[model samples]
Target: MADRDRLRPPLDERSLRDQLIGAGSGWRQLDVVAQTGSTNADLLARAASGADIDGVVLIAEHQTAGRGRHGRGWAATARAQIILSVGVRVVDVPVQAWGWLSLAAGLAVLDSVAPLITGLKWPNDVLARGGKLAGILAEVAQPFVVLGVGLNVTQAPEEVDPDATSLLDLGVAAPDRNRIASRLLRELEARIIQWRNANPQLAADYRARSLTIGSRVRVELPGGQDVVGIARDIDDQGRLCLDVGGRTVVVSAGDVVHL
Candidate 1:
């Protein structure tokens, strides 16, 4: 039992619920499960079945079938990651501006783990130790968007991949998973409201904290097309503005490789 606690201390669900789900808190309900398949899918299914998914927050201590962008599997050591998903029904934000939701989520993640991890990659990746520390995936279900964040918490260097780093590996000597989760929830509550209002500060901070802007990039588009350019800016709709061969090209979807 001592070894188990040292490896992965449990998150206090009751304390978190009391702190995050009430007046001034946008979240309607909070659930922290010991294990699950995927929080995103669970909430998406709930929303599709006509449940009141708005502001529903679901977290899993261990995900047996978590996923990242492009349907890639996300496998972290059990209890070594903060696997969170929130269901939101957008009534204020227009559809065109909805693209910013993912980037907004990235800002919330960075806000949760500041000082130690400050760099944010394009779209929805948080970087630490020059490797991916967290990845966000947003799945839409009609009126509700299930935004999922998989944040690497306490994994040792050897426990992760070559292109990944965790909070513990980033000199965080002693990492607290509960505090991180709560901070993320607090940040997201504020950020999503700003996002719905189309607040320019979100975009400004996104650009200011970006690791992609002004960097040379090779954007791999779908259907085997590639465009080499310099990532110049993020437009109003959160599209990447790339200067390709002396012309600014706006692309919404691509696998951007920073060169």
Candidate 2:
């Protein structure tokens, strides 16, 4: 077992439910497990089961089948980090206005780590010293949105291709797992409230945390076509606005790599 796993491992069934019992839970119910394939997968299946529109949160300490953008598997080191996925019922927000949620979630994670690590690769990735520190993946299910989150808390996998580190690994020593989890939840709750107002000015902070804008980027489109451009800024819809060969384009799909 990893050192941190032994330090404060994943919560069991009864403990998970008991911990969330006293929070201002809204109409939602929070469910947790020691391990799972993916929180998003579990919630999506629950939504399909005709679950009502309430704020549902599904979590796991280790995701056996976690995933990132473009169908890539997420790297997890046993119980070393946080893998949280939340389900929300969109009441009045339109389909076109939903892009902001990704930014909202990213900003939330960035806020959570600001006391320790704070940098972002806009639209959805949070970074620490130019390596990935956290990421957000939003999956829509009609009236409900499942926001999948992976936050690097203790350590990222050593065998990973890209360099990554956790809060403790960066030399900012921290406490047990429950403390980390609660702090993240507090930050996320505050950020979500700020987003509920739909403030357009929030885009400025989101852009400021990003280092991608003004840098050259190569984007891979869904049809396998590729385009090179300069990432300029994020639009109101939270899309990655790219100046591709002098034409400003809002890239809605593709994997972006800084070149």
Candidate 3:
């Protein structure tokens, strides 16, 4: 107990609920659980069970079964990561365009952390200080969408995995989980408002903040195929355009590694 306290602090749940659960807020209910199987699964079940969960935010201090894209998973230490999932109803942004929502949420993550990110790695990984600082996952159940993300908030350099980075490890001395959530919610809501309007600037914004573009990358395609090329740009369909040899190939799904 003493060691955990000295390394990490609990999120201020009362302050979060008091500030976020009200009129004009993007969030309706803010749930902070000490531990959960997965916030995404929890809220996904609610939406699937015919519950009115639009604008619901489910935060888990620790997730035993948290998942990311490409079937990856995580279970962070309690309060050492900012892990949450949001439920919302998106309209007019065609199903094809829903992919961009994850990128938009990536922008929110970047803004929430600010100035420390190397930039987003392709779809939505926040790479900071040359290592992955955060990861985002977005799932759609018809009209309702669940945007889930986990940001390593208070990890000491000695406590983190070798491949990932954390807020504290990257120069944030006094990381506050509440403040991170608030900024994320506000920025995400702003992006959703813009999304509802079918604005053109999202692509522009994503292009500007992308770390994947113009880099020699090795993309692991579906079914174990691999493509090595220069990441040219994001297509109109929100897919990565890769220049392989002399032709432009579109990558719709894969993990991209800058090589």
Candidate 4:
């Protein structure tokens, strides 16, 4: 990689703190670290420590052991991606609606990045220009749920996997990590609150931007079962609706492959 090609913009923590951690920001606390094993793991452990950590946001510039869905390994160079997690509590919301948290977070990411990218796969995979650009993960810990997001910002072509992409790979002027991180948090906060309030438009907006809705997909279900059908809709409970022959099937959990 050329010297000019390497980009590592420092995050403006002071400005972020002033904008997010103060009054009316909707965030209880903001912590930015230079390096860590995993922000989600860190926040999860902290939440287990019996502290009131609702609405706390933790960001890591470099994550040594970040993870994805189904225990898949997530890796990125230092400052090459936006890596963070937010802790939220679901009090009055029904347990069934908890499944929507990850989907809402995916919509938040799409809203944050705007027209710079397109295509949201089933559940919470962000795709752009026919390649993956971001991913979301949500885990429950009693009253608190941790929502983690990872976004590729400025990785070079060779630095990314064959099926992955970055903002720089899209051939657009990339936004700095600070702007991306701040915007993401703001969007996430709004979406989480809206979802908790049982807003119907949350699923509507998600369906509008969905790329897998009309395509033929093959879902790998548990117990080695596979279902092939046309992706049709997202049901009220945030399950993916598939048209398999004469019946409409709803899938709550599985791996989806766009064929």
Candidate topping lDDT: 1
What is the C-alpha local distance difference test score of each model? 0.82, 0.70, 0.79, 0.81
Q: Summarize candidate 1's per-residue lDDT along 52-167 as a digit string, tens digits.
A: 89889999988888877776777766778899999878654464466788898988898889945457888778987588889888877778789999998886545656788888
Candidate 1 backbone collisions, by pair: none
Candidate 4 segments exceeding 4 Å error: 1-6, 21-23, 93-96, 115-117, 222-224
Instruction: Name the Cα RMSD for model 2.
Output: 2.9
Question: Which ranges in model 2 have alpha carbons more than 4 Å from their true place?
Answer: 1-5, 11-27, 91-96, 159-162, 222-224
Q: TM-scores for all candidates? A: 0.92, 0.85, 0.90, 0.91
lDDT, residue 230, model 1: 97
Flag clash pairs in model 3. Answer: none
Q: Is candidate 1 or candidate 3 better by TM-score?
A: 1
- Candidate 2 achieves a global lDDT of 0.70
Measured on C-alpha atoms, candidate 1 has an lDDT of 0.82
How many residue pairs clash in all the candidates, one count each? Answer: 0, 0, 0, 0
Per-residue CA lDDT of candidate 3, range 24-127, in tens? 68667888899999898898899899987778888888888778777877647778888989887865445347777788888888888884338889876888
What local lDDT score does residue 198 receive in model 3, on the 0 to 100 scale?
68
Best by TM-score: 1
User: Residue pairs in steric clash, candidate 2?
Assistant: none
Worst 10 residues of 3 by lDDT: 90-99
Cα lDDT tens digits for candidate 4, 7-118: 5776778878876755368898888899999888998899899976689989888888888877786776777888899998865646447778889988888888885546
